[PDB]
Amino acid sequence: REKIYQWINELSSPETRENALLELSKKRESVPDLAPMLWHSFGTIAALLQEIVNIYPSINPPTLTAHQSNRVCNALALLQCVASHPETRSAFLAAHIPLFLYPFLHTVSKTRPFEYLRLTSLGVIGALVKTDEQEVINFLLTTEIIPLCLRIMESGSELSKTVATFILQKILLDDTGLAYICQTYERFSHVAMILGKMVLQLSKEPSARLLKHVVRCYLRLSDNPRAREALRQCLPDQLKDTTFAQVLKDDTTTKRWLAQLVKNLQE
Amino acid sequence: EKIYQWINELSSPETRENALLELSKKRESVPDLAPMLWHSFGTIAALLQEIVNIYPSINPPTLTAHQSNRVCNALALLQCVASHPETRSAFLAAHIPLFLYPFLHTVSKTRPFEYLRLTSLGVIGALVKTDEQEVINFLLTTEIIPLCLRIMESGSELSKTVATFILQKILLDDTGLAYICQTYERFSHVAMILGKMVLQLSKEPSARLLKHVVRCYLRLSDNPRAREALRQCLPDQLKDTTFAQVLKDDTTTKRWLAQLVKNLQE
Numbered sequence: 052r053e054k055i056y057q058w059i060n061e062l063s064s065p066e067t068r069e070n071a072l073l074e075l076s077k078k079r080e081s082v083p084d085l086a087p088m089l090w091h092s093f094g095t096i097a098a099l100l101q102e103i104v105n106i107y108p109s110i111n112p113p114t115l116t117a118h119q120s121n122r123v124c125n126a127l128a129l130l131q132c133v134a135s136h137p138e139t140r141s142a143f144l145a146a147h148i149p150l151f152l153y154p155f156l157h158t159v160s161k162t163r164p165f166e167y168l169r170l171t172s173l174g175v176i177g178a179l180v181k182t183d184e185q186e187v188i189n190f191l192l193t194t195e196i197i198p199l200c201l202r203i204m205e206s207g208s209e210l211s212k213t214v215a216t217f218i219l220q221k222i223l224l225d226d227t228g229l230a231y232i233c234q235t236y237e238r239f240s241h242v243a244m245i246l247g248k249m250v251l252q253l254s255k256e257p258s259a260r261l262l263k264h265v266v267r268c269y270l271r272l273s274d275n276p277r278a279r280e281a282l283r284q285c286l287p288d289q290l291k292d293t294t295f296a297q298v299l300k301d302d303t304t305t306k307r308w309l310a311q312l313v314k315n316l317q318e
Numbered sequence: 319e320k321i322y323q324w325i326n327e328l329s330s331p332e333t334r335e336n337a338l339l340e341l342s343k344k345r346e347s348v349p350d351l352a353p354m355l356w357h358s359f360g361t362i363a364a365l366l367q368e369i370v371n372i373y374p375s376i377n378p379p380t381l382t383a384h385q386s387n388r389v390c391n392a393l394a395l396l397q398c399v400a401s402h403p404e405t406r407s408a409f410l411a412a413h414i415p416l417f418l419y420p421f422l423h424t425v426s427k428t429r430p431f432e433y434l435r436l437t438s439l440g441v442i443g444a445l446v447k448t449d450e451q452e453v454i455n456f457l458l459t460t461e462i463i464p465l466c467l468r469i470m471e472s473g474s475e476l477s478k479t480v481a482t483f484i485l486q487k488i489l490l491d492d493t494g495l496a497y498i499c500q501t502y503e504r505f506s507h508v509a510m511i512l513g514k515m516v517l518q519l520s521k522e523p524s525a526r527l528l529k530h531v532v533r534c535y536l537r538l539s540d541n542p543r544a545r546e547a548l549r550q551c552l553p554d555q556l557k558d559t560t561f562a563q564v565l566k567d568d569t570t571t572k573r574w575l576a577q578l579v580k581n582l583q584e
C-alpha cells in the first residue's frame with residue numbers, strides 16, 4: 052500500500068504523472084484492488100483518458116513514437132485493470148471508455164509502436180468480455196467493433212490476431228452476437244473468409260492459442276443453421292484432413308472442439 | 319417520421335453526411351432530439367466517428383471549410399445531447415467532451431480551424447449553462463481551463479468570448495473559485511491572461527468580451543486572500559476613464575466594475 056496511494060495521487064500534475072503511470076503499471080498484478088482505487092480516485096480516470104486523447108493526432112498520419120506508445124500503453128494497462136475488476140467492470144462500460152480505444156484499433160501501421168498500441172488496446176477489450184455480460188456484447192456490437200477485429204485478425208501480429216479472435220469468439224458465444232454475425236450471407240462470409248485464410252497460414256506457421264480460438268469460432272458458427280449449411284461447403288479442408296493432427300495431440304480441449312465441429316456439419 | 323429516418327441513417331457512412339446536415343438544422347425544432355440520439359450507443363459512436371475522422375487533419379493542419387462544416391454539424395448534435403437534462407449526465411460519464419480536446423489544442427488561424435475551435439467551445443459552454451455541480455466537477459479534472467486561457471488571448475473575437483465565458487461560469491461556482499485560488503500557479507496564470515486581455519481590449523474594444531473579463535475579476539475578488547494579489551495586478555484601464563465610454567451602455571458591467579473596485583479597497 053506504501054507507494055500505491057502516493058503514485059495514484061501523483062497521476063494529477065503532469066509533472067509527476069509519467070513516473071506514476073509506469074510505477075503503477077508494473078505493480079498492477081499485485082495490488083488486487085487497484086481498479087476500484089483507480090476508479091474511485093478523484094480525477095484519476097480522467098487523467099488516464101487525457102493520456103489517450105493526447106496522442107490522437109500522432110495516430111494518423113502515423114507518426115507515433117516508441118516513447119509515446121509506451122506511456123499511453125501504461126495508461127491503457129491501468130484501464131484494462133479497471134475493465135476486468137468485478138467492482139468496476141459495469142461502470143467502466145457505462146462510461147463507454149472502450150470508445151476511446153477505437154481510433155487506436157483502426158490504425159494499420161506496422162511499426163512496433165503501433166503494433167504495441169493495438170495489442171494493449173485489444174487487451175482492454177478482451178478483459179471487458181472475459182465475463183460474458185450481455186450488455187458488453189451488445190455494446191461491442193452496436194459500436195462496430197467487429198470490423199476492427201476482423202481487419203486485425205486479417206493483417207495484424209500473431210499476438211494481436213489472437214486477442215482479436217478471442218474477442219470475436221466471445222461475441223459469437225452469446226446468442227445475440229452469433230445471430231448478428233450470421234444475419235446476412237455477406238457478414239458471415241466475411242468472417243468465414245478471414246477465419247479461412249487464418250486456417251491456411253496456421254497450417255504452415257502453427258500457433259496453439261490462435262488455432263484454439265479459430266476452432267471455437269468455427270464450432271460456434273456451426274450452431275447457426277445457415278452458417279452450418281454454408282460451412283458444409285466452405286469449411287477449409289485442413290480442418291477435416293489430419294493436417295492439424297500432431298499439434299492438437301496435446302491440446303485435448305481444442306481437439307474435442309474440432310471433433311464436435313465436424314460432427315455438427317453434414318448429417 | 320423523417321427525424322427517426324435520418325437518425326437511423328447516421329449509422330451508415332453512406333447516408334451519414336446527409337443525416338448530419340438535416341438533423342443539425344432541424345435541431346431547434348425537435349425537443350427531445352438528445353434522448354432520441356442517445357437512445358442507441360450506436361448513434362453516439364457514429365457521431366464520434368465524425369469527430370475522429372478529423373484528427374488526421376491536425377498536423378500538418380489541412381482542415382478544409384468542407385471538413386470543418388461537416389464535423390461541426392456533428393458537434394451541434396453532440397451539443398444538444400450535452401444540454402438536455404435527460405442525457406447531460408450520461409454524456410459526462412462517458413467523458414465525451416474529451417474527444418474535442420485535440421481540436422481545442424490546435425493553433426492554426428485558418429478559418430476552418432478557428433470555426434472548429436469556436437464550435438467545440440460551444441459544446442463546453444452549453445454544459446456550463448446548465449448550472450450543474452456535476453459539470454464543474456467534470457471540467458476541473460479535465461484541463462479545460464488551460465485550453466480556454468490560451469484561446470482567450472490568441473483566438474478571434476467570438477472564440478475569446480466563449481472561452482472567457484466558460485472560465486466565468488467555472489469561477490462563479492464556489493468549488494471553481496476555490497480551485498483556481500488553490501495554488502499560486504493557477505491563480506497567477508488566470509490573473510495574467512485577464513491582464514493581457516483588458517490591454518488589447520482598450521485598443522480594439524469589444525462590449526461582450528469586456529463584460530466577461532470584468533465579471534471574472536469581480537468573482538475572483540470574492541476570495542478574501544486573493545484580494546492583495548488582485549490589488550497589485552489590476553490594470554489601470556479598469557481603474558481609469560477608459561471603457562467609461564465603451565460602458566455607456568453597460569449599466570451591468572459598470573455596476574460590476576464598481577463592486578470590483580469596492581472589494582479591493584483596503
Ligand SMILES: [Mn+2]
Binds near residue numbers: 185
Ligand atoms: Mn445472450
